[PDB]
Enzyme design. Structure first.
Site, PDB file in Angstrom:
ATOM      1  CG  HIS A   1      24.652  73.041  99.837  1.00 23.46           C
ATOM      2  ND1 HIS A   1      25.324  72.280  98.904  1.00 23.46           N
ATOM      3  CD2 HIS A   1      23.333  72.859  99.591  1.00 23.46           C
ATOM      4  CE1 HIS A   1      24.448  71.665  98.128  1.00 23.46           C
ATOM      5  NE2 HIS A   1      23.234  72.000  98.523  1.00 23.46           N
TER       6      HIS A   1
ATOM      7  CE1 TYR B   1      23.850  69.807  94.954  1.00 25.99           C
ATOM      8  CE2 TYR B   1      24.061  71.287  93.088  1.00 25.99           C
ATOM      9  CZ  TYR B   1      23.460  70.941  94.278  1.00 25.99           C
ATOM     10  OH  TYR B   1      22.465  71.730  94.801  1.00 25.99           O
TER      11      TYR B   1
ATOM     12  CG  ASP C   1      22.228  75.830  91.721  1.00 30.55           C
ATOM     13  OD1 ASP C   1      22.292  76.932  92.306  1.00 30.55           O
ATOM     14  OD2 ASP C   1      22.127  74.742  92.323  1.00 30.55           O
TER      15      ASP C   1
END
Ligand SMILES: NC(=O)c1ccc[n+]([C@@H]2O[C@H](COP(=O)([O-])OP(=O)(O)OC[C@H]3O[C@@H](n4cnc5c(N)ncnc54)[C@H](OP(=O)(O)O)[C@@H]3O)[C@@H](O)[C@H]2O)c1
Ligand SMILES: COc1ccccc1NC(=O)c1ccccc1OCc1c(C)noc1C
Length: 314
Positions: free
Chosen positions: A112, A50, A45
């Site tokens: 997201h 990120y 994931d």
């Protein structure tokens, strides 16, 4: 162990969470994702947010190159960030994520978050008064652009993240809907177990994927320090002693036995390898009822700023 998605593809029920605070060097994502694959993880994931897709992609390519795994054995997830909700930005955002990771496709591409933000280069666009700048986007048009990513084969499956029931219904009832979301990745753990949202997702053939299932990273920026620590919970510790396991493994097994796909972040080799032992034991019906009783509507994500967004899901 995989669950069949509503579009026919398969998703491994245990996934490796790769987000680490920017304190952590970018090289670490490469090393631990390689350790996760070596320990048995096949569901990985990531997200544009990120800032690690190049390193995560390098780890996948590394285990493909050395012979351990074929690309078909890996389930790789990325996510469209909230600054790219406008339909014309969705496909270039996916292609950029693919270019960073050096993959031809992602197994899963997610919206997201439903809380749209100002388009631009900043992940968190902030105005002259220190306030994050919201954007207003019809999320049904974002979804239509996501569907074309599946059409083109750049994403095998598409889903959402941090959506509530109202938000899910908005996409499911969209006229001309081509693909339902295969999943809704939400915060889910014994203190916040989303039993009603999970029931709704099951009724719609949508997989619930739990993040922060181990109680979160308790980041100093968001998580309240006085918030309860999930892995120190007495009931999870009692069950860990009963089963000769750890609290983290009880929390993970809890989600698997209620039909929830569960993510687990660790940047520690021994804890990464320990987490795949979730498949080695079973909780009793009374065990599950005891964990159900921990539910107290506590979310480790806490933000005064987004609480005012029109699309705030809580
Ligand atoms: N869609 C979204 O909005 C969203 C939001 C948050 C997270 N996520 C994703 O879900 C993944 C996991 O969520 P999370 O970031 O909140 O972390 P998490 O899975 O809840 O884990 C929290 C902490 O538990 C520790 N841990 C891991 N295994 C352990 C074990 N066997 N025993 C004891 N402690 C253990 C880890 O510390 P150590 O590293 O030291 O082992 C980790 O920092 C993330 O990486 C991210 O991919 C998505
Ligand atoms: C709105 O969140 C952010 C906006 C800007 C920058 C970062 C974030 N969120 C995070 O880094 C985050 C970190 C840990 C757990 C949970 C987190 O976010 C959960 C969430 C919810 C709820 N809705 O959307 C998201 C995303």
């Amino acid at each position: 162990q995989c669950v069949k998605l509503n579009d026919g593809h398969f998703m491994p029920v245990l996934g490796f969470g790769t987000y680490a605070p920017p304190e952590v060097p970018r090289s670490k994502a490469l090393e631990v994702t390689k350790l996760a694959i070596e320990a048995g993880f096949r569901h990985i994931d990531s997200a544009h947010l990120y800032n690690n897709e190049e390193q995560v992609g390098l780890a996948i390519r590394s285990k493909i190159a050395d012979g351990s795994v074929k690309r078909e054995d890996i389930f790789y997830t990325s996510k469209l960030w909230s600054t790219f909700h406008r339909p014309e930005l969705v496909r270039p955002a996916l292609e950029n994520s693919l270019k960073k990771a050096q993959l031809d496709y992602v197994d899963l591409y997610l919206i997201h978050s439903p809380m749209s933000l100002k388009p631009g280069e900043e992940l968190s666009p902030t105005d002259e008064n220190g306030k994050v700048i919201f954007d207003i986007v019809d999320l049904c048009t974002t979804w239509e652009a996501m569907e074309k990513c599946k059409d083109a084969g750049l994403a095998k499956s598409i889903g959402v993240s941090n959506f509530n029931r109202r938000q899910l219904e908005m996409i499911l009832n969209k006229p001309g809907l081509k693909y339902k979301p295969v999943c809704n990745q939400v915060e889910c753990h014994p203190y916040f177990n989303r039993s009603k949202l999970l029931d709704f997702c099951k009724s719609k053939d949508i997989v619930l994927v739990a993040y922060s299932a181990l109680g979160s990273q308790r980041d100093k920026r968001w998580v309240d320090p006085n918030s309860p620590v999930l892995l120190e919970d007495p009931v999870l510790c009692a069950l860990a002693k009963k089963h000769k396991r750890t609290p983290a493994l009880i929390a993970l097994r809890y989600q698997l036995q209620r039909g929830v796909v569960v993510l687990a972040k660790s940047y520690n080799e021994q804890r990464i390898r320990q987490n795949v032992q979730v498949f080695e034991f079973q909780l009793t019906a009374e065990d599950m009822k005891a964990i159900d009783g921990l539910d107290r509507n506590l979310h480790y994500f806490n933000s005064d700023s987004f609480a005012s967004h029109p699309n705030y899901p809580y």
